[PDB]
Amino acid sequence: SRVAKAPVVVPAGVDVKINGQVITIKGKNGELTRTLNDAVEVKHADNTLTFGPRDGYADGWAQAGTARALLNSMVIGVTEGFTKKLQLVGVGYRAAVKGNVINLSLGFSHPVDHQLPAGITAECPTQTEIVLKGADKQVIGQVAADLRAYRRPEPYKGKGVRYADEVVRTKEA
Amino acid sequence: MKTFTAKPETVKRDWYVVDATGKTLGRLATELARRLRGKHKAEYTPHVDTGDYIIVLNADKVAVTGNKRTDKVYYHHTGHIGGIKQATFEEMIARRPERVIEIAVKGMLPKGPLGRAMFRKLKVYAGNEHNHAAQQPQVLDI
Amino acid sequence: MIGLVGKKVGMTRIFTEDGVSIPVTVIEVEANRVTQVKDLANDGYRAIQVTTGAKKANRVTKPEAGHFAKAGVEAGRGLWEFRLAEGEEFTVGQSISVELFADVKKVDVTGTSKGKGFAGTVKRWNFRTQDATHGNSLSHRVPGSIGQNQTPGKVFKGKKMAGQMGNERVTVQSLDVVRVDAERNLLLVKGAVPGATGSDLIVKPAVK
Amino acid sequence: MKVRASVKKLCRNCKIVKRDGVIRVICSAEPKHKQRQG
Amino acid sequence: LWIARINAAARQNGISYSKFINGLKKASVEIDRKILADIAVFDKVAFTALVEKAKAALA
RNA sequence: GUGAAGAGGGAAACAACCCAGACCGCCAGCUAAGGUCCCAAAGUCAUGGUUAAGUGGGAAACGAUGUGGGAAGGCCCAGACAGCCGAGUCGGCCUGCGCGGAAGAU
RNA sequence: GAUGUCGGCUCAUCACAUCCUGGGGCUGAAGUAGGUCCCAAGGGUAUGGCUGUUCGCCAUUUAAAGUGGUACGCGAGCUGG
RNA sequence: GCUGAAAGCAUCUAAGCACGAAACUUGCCCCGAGAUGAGUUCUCCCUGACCCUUUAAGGGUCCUGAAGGAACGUUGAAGAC
């Protein structure tokens, strides 16, 4: 509603194509495609995109708001991109990168190897720090969560894999 | 005079073909059962079979409403103590798509020898092809 | 993979230099001859059919003779079938010998077990005997109770009772291959296998 | 998790949400406040 | 039995049994169900004429 | 009041509940209680609303931003609510239909 | 004008309000070991001394020695304390 | 748990996407086309004359007797028969 009534500006250098309910956005950082719900109409005025309901559906405004948010994110991604940062805390915990595989040592009796998906890049500016880059918000979030699940922060010392800006509470015995 | 009765040795039967893509299951099954029994002909006689032959195509594309595609359950028992078994609509469509329409039609027909005989005129397929071109079926729009 | 058809000869032992004794079953595996190849277009699945042995001429009927003559092979004592895996090829008239097992480590063997005829519950199902004294009345090896009262009022299906025992198809899995001798057509395996001396056996590479 | 028939907010950081047909209470300050109706 | 046969014959001409009976009553026809079924089976032009009569009465 | 000493139609089956009192025959017609998608006789009838739980087709004290209707209040273009500027937003009351509470033996 | 009633032996079959093994949330959860609630019925689940005992107490084991329905399962299958 | 509005924030859910157990469906072993919906593939055998009648999936005489099967005998690490 309030979110769906704000149009999205299409900055110079990006190509937009619409066909039925399928949308493609192309830019210097790559190409993204999506298929929208049957209760949204999207229009390409001159340099802006607008979203609105279709008559006959009872949840038009909510779906329109969701579509607006998703398209905004696509446009930002094909120009700037998204990045995430992960940190390791503990004694003997380490990480490294080779090709598109991350190697983790996290206190187990066996090593951990993670295979990155298509379109995501990784870097290690230190043995205790990981930086991920890409153009898809959902995929970058999922990859960060998958990496964090190998060893979650624990409440007595804070050891494990955490996000850079994450507040970890502690307590005493 | 006496009321008219139909004779099994001189009845006339015809061949039809139907497409099941996107149709609601029970509202198709009622029509199929009506025409297999023969309630659409003015010669209907309860103890004689006076129905037609029907081919059904595209049985894996039949539709249901609500949450039935994951919440309708088919049950049966094997005869051994403890042998009660079940499946869902999705699973049935995945392994034996024809049984879905066959079971529904069989439940709507008379129980007995004559109903078992009426069932034999139904031919159900899963794709878009059949091998009964020598019988020359005509298209039926339900 | 495919397997072979052989015959049970007997049992013996092998002595090792370290002082161990290994009990072995001896299996004679002659050459298997291919009689038919089945493909997807004509039959709907992929398999081969084989024969082995020899048979006397005046005991072969005309249908069987024609079947063997189409292939161009001598008559044998039976026909058997094996399913093919992706990337396996054979031709009609080919021979297969025991060198197929030169590098296999474990096998499965199938045969027909010995016959005991009509048997009781003590021998057939490991039921316990009742007392031999203390006033027992004609009920020493009898089965006992076979149900409940008015609910349910019948006997369930699958109940354990007396009947025929033995003389059926059995498989024993994961047996070591002790030796392959190609000049005498012998395969030596470790342990016991189903059947009696002189019966037919089917040998395949192990599935587990 | 507390499973019970009466579920309610116990402090100012508690929230009420409905997930897949179930009424739940989730809190950002206290893990002891996590509740499920059933 | 007579009623079932009449329903089958009328739906072939484009009307239901209940409407057909109402139309005959409003047109003042007094033929009974035995004779109606007989005509349905043995003479179809006459049955079509009767249906037209009932439709005109209802119109 | 009915069964006993009473048949016929309905309530799946079901003396005592609902409709209704069988002198005999007919391959005529109208209705009662109850019904009209198929088993199985007759509207896949017409017009305006509510439900998304297969509720309809088993059950309470109590709990909850499910959602339809009605009558009043407080703040707001002299800038309100939320977050970090530009149109609405807060909390009670009366009422319709749904959701959790809800574990058993072939 | 008859449906043989306690306990033992032999042979079982179902529920789930779960005794062991499997998966989880909270802890007044440092680790080892525990408390409480949710999901889960595939398989498994003692031998002796005393007494007619079912129970119960005691001795020594086990990952564990579950609770109930089936004419308080089962005498045209056995016993007869 | 990820992304995300209705509700300018927040939210695992309403639209979309990802994990998750000896329970479920398969994978292992045995029976199985009386599966009357009675299935598929390979091979083998039979190539003469007449009559009548109510004229049809009709009855009869002569010549011919295949592929194979059963019966009998000597029997089995197969068996109540």
Helices and strands (DSSP H and E) totals, chain E? 4, 0
The DSSP letter of residue C168 is S
Q: CA of B16, closest CA in chain E: separation in Å? A: 18
The two structure tokens encoding residue C182: 């190609």
CB contact under 8 A, E12 and B42: yes
Contacts of A67 (CB under 8 A, 6+ apart): A4, A36, A37, A40, A42, A51
Q: What is the resolution of this structure in A?
A: 2.1
A97-117 burial, b if ≥16 CB within 10 A, otherwise e?
beeeebebebeeeeeeebebe
- Distance in angstroms between the alpha carbons of the first and the last residue of chain E: 29
Question: A with E: 3 or more CB pairs under 8 Å?
Answer: no
CA D15 to C1' F81 (Å) is 19
Distance, CA of B101 to C1' of H5, in Å: 40
- E33 touching B, CB under 8 A? no
d(CA B21, CA A1): 37
Per the structure, the complete domain to which residue C196 belongs is given by 1-208
Breaks in chain C (C–N beyond 2.5 Å) sit after: none
Nearest to B59 by CA among B37, B82, B88, B92: B92
Residues, chain C: 208
Q: Which domains does chain A have, with CATH numbers?
A: 8-76 (3.90.930.12), 82-163 (3.90.930.12)
Determined by which method? cryo-EM
For C58-90, letters b (16+ CB in 10 Å) and e give eeeeeeeeebbeebebebbeeebebebeeeeee
| Strand-strand pairing, B53-57 and B15-19 | parallel
CA A42/CA C135 separation, integer angstroms: 95
d(CA A45, CA C139): 98
Residues recorded for chain A: 173
Q: Report the C-alpha gap between B135 and D13 in whole angstroms.
A: 75
Asked if E12 CB < 7 A from strand F, the reply is: no
Check CB contact under 8 Å for C156 and B79.
no
Nearest of C188, C172, C191 to residue C180 by alpha carbon: C188
In angstroms, the CA C195 to CA C79 distance is: 19
The distance from CA A74 to its chain's CA centroid, rounded to whole angstroms, is 10
Q: What is the largest CA-CA distance in chain E?
A: 29
Which nucleotides of strand H come closer than 7 angstroms to any CB of the protein?
Answer: 1-18, 25, 28-31, 37, 40-45, 67-69, 77-80
- Does the CB of C140 sit below 7 A from strand G? no
List Cβ<8 Å contacts ≥24 apart for A2-7.
A3/A65, A3/A68, A3/A69, A4/A51, A4/A52, A4/A61, A4/A64, A4/A65, A4/A67, A4/A68, A6/A68, A7/A45, A7/A48, A7/A49, A7/A50
Task: Tell me how far apart the alpha carbons of residues C193 and C189 are, in angstroms, rounded to a whole number.
Answer: 9
Q: In which residue are the tokens 């090896």 written?
A: C141
Size of interface B-C (CB pairs under 8 A): 7
**How many Cα neighbours within 13 Å face the side chain of C9?**
14
CA dihedral sign, ordered C174, C180, C186, C189? negative
d(CA A9, CA A68): 11
Is the CA virtual torsion C21, C25, C28, C29 positive or negative? negative
Mutation site, C148, C151, C157, interface B, largest B CB count within 10 A: C157
**Chain C positions in Cβ-Cβ contact with residue B77 (cut-off 8 Å):** none
The count of C-alpha atoms lying within 13 angstroms of the C-alpha of A81, restricted to the half-sphere facing its C-beta, is 12
Domain boundaries, chain B: 1-142
Which residues on adjacent β-strands are paired with residue C203? C4, C109
Q: Give the Å distances, CA to CA, from E21 to B13, B51, C55, E3, E52.
A: 30, 27, 85, 11, 13
Are C2 and C80 in contact, with CB atoms under 8 Å apart? no
- Interatomic CA–C1' length for residue D4 and nucleotide F101, angstroms: 9
Question: Considering its fold, how many domains does chain C have in total?
Answer: 1
DSSP 8-state assignment for residue C85: P
